[PDB]
Paper text:
Subsequent studies in [name], Xenopus, Zebrafish, and Drosophila confirmed the role of [name] as a myosin-specific chaperone, promoting the folding of the myosin ATPase domain as well as coordinating the assembly of thick filaments during muscle development. To better understand its myosin folding function, we established an orthogonal protein folding assay in insect cells, characterizing the interplay of the [name] muscle myosin MHC-B with its cognate chaperone [name]. Structural data of various functional mutants clarify the role of the distinct [name] domains in this process providing important mechanistic insight into its myosin folding activity.
In contrast, none of the ts-proteins shifted into the HMW fraction further confirming that the ts-mutants, present in a folded state, cannot interact with damaged myosin. Together, the cellular folding assay, the CD data and the SEC-based reconstitution analysis demonstrate that the ts-mutations L559S, G427E, E781K and L822F have a direct effect on the myosin-binding function of [name], abrogating the interaction with the heat-damaged myosin substrate. To address the structural basis of the impaired chaperone function of [name] ts-mutants L822F and G427E, and [name] ΔTPR, we analyzed the crystal structures of the three mutant proteins. The two [name] ts-mutants L822F and G427E crystallized in the form of a linear filament, having the same periodicity (85 Å), hydrophobic interface and overall domain organization as the previously characterized wt oligomer. However, when we compared the UCS domains of wt and ts [name], we noted two major differences. First, the ts UCS domains adopt different conformations, as most clearly seen for the C-terminal portion of the UCS domain that moves about 10–15 Å. Moreover, as revealed by the L822F structure, the entire UCS domain is able to move en-bloc towards the TPR/central domain backbone of the [name] molecule. A second difference of wt [name] and ts mutants comprises the dynamics of the UCS domain. In contrast, the two ts mutants crystallized exclusively in one state, even when testing a large number of crystals for an alternate crystal form. Likewise, the L822F ts mutation causes local changes inducing movement of the UCS domain towards the TPR/central backbone. As for the G427E mutant, the established inter-domain contacts reduce the conformational flexibility of the UCS domain, which seems to be a common property of the analyzed ts mutants.
Numbering used by the authors: 7 to 38, 43 to 508, 524 to 605, 627 to 915, 923 to 938
Amino acid sequence: TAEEIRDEGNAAVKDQDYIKADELYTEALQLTKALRPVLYRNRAMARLKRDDFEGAQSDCTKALEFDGADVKALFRRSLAREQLGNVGPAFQDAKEALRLSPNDKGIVEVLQRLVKANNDKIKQTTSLANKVTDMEKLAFRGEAKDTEQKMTALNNLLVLCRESESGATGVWNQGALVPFVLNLINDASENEEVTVTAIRILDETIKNSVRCMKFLAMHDPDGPKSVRFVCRLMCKKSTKDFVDATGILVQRVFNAMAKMDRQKEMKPDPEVAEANKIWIIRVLLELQEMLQDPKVGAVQRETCIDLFLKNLMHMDGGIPRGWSWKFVEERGLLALLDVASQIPELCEYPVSAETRQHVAICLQRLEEDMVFDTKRTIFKEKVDMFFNALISRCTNDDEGHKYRIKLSCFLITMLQGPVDIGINLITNDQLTPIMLEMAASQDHLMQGIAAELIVATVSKHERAINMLKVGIPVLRALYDSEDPTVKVRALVGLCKIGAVISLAKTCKKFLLETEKYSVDIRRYACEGLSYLSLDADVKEWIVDDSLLLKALVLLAKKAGALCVYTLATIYANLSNAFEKHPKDTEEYVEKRVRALVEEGAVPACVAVSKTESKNALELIARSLLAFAEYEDLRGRIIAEGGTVLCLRLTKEASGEGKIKAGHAIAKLGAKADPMISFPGQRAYEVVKPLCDLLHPDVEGKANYDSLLTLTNLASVSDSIRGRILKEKAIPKIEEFWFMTDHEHLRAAAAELLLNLLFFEKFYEETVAPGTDRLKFWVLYSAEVEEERLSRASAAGFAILTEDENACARIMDEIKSWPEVFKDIAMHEDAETQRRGLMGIANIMHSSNKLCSEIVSSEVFRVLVAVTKLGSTEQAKRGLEAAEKF
């Protein structure tokens, strides 16, 4: 339609929903030759309110190729270059915007900032250069006789580049940071955390898109080999943290290519995606070459699969539409299916036991990303080609045994990820004789793989029973094995369709033996016990043994993110965290939760949580929500990494698990110290979910905890207050603040709006003559049965009456002010009396007419009664105003 979309974007700006407006103007630019500058200007304003300053600068630079006399592009680019640290060109843009519109007050405020910033710019740059020179000679250029002081220099550079955009500019040092890091990575005799902290510094530095594309194209004048070096940096070392940090570097490369960020909820710009499309296809080709390269190790391959998972799918904030289609139609899907056919016992390229779930989540996300029925059909055609290619080589020879193994691995990875495609492949009647052949074999690995295939088949739907009718007794045969690798895989399935007491004892027997039984055994034991744990008797049975909980925690810390679904299902059922029997009672729920938290459930949760499964992270979020119910435990939950984990869960879980993670954060920070519980930049990113908890219409218990946590967060710094105002929270808080039969919600809303008055924009909106906010600030000071509302509103009345226009509006707009004032002057609570007399006193110091109105009123007798006996000094100050006038 190409024309109503900017109208919808303008309506989204007027609704103050700026990410929707950014997406709409990005959509409207895609349907275009003189309507483009309006789109770039309004999209620059939308990105500027979005804290996207690079994109605002880009859209203003593109909007000036049409008319260089454009005051909007100049002003918005001055703001964007201000927030990026380039104050000189910001000054020049704002100077040209001032000489083309000399009466705009916003440009005057911008010039008032930028002249003071340009007078001190050179000293700030040379001081920052001296700081990074000190820390960078002590970190990279070899002035250190100890490892931990080089570590301290690296942590200082990391905090400095995370503090400001100018800090990242100074640490970048026009591109000397990446030789200083690469000639440290290639030193194999250097410490792990040194290298990982250096790469964390580099990842923060590349968050800029221009520096990151510069970083991509600089290692070799041949483009694809520079791309290959950047993508193969993870193969330089075998440590997990190194591979994770290098994967974050490649994530930065993707985020600079498409101009996307899933952490910032930033859908990509297709103009800058098509602009450097060649770099995107080069990185995708190099990573899918890394999927099947046997010189690439296991965790590097898992990281590449996670990069495809996060980045390629356009339905999950990734690389836009047409790229995953190309990935399926070409040889990338077949590479994922070939990695799906792998086990550590039989692999062609290195594959760990965790690789299967990474492939399964990536394949499920890709099957979801094929949105139309034809592309889903092409997906099914390629998996049928791979299925038929495997099953045509399943001969009865020794060679065909490994193809039977590959076929079974393929189908298990199907049934753990894209479940319905797997169920469609199970209903082949050529498939179940292969299972009956490998189950009746002498090879124990084939017996185990048949057992885990037929437990992968057990779901709710009944058309899989076509195999399960022969699968369940065969499984009951395999439980009679004297091999534990077959016995636990047959114990799953027995636990999954259901005797139960006998099973639970068998799962406990496998799980308690920690040294002699490996994590491969205890994983399937934990999976079977997760299947059993829906019954509350076995819940109380698990909780009543402490050493079983210790064994589950040891399995979590040693197996890592391999037992996420199982342990998270255990923790969710034991905590009764699923929303809705004599033993699912809140005393018993509290007993189970306290026992879990007492023996390390939260470090187990943070140990298993390094996956991209939205469902398993939803389970972890529900577990942490049920953990954070109890007020004496939540400090230990904060101390055991719970706040950072829930801040990850509110970004990367399922859509209904984000809500549970946010309610968990609200519980954790309701009655806690926000400097300890949310230290530093964390207190920024906690503002985003908690405002989304504010539902005055739904009216749950999450609203009070969210108001208390935002009240605590609004007391630490002004940036928190501005971001609370930025997230459209003020009407949501005012809806609680207007409630009549809800005392404590109104009190918490008054406390939060009291702490938000120290932010000057909300202070100026409260004084402003549009609203009746001052009326409620005055009348809630005299609404006297609730001490806390009166204290908060009297404090706000004391603060808001050091503006004389607010004093005049309180006088002429609020009728029955003398009753309110004589009540808060005689007031029973000391804090309310003190702040109310402070407000009355600076009303009288504000004007002579208003002081003459007060002295000739009902308020004067109680003022002179207070002065003739802390709050007496404020009434004395008001009588000093009366003596002055």
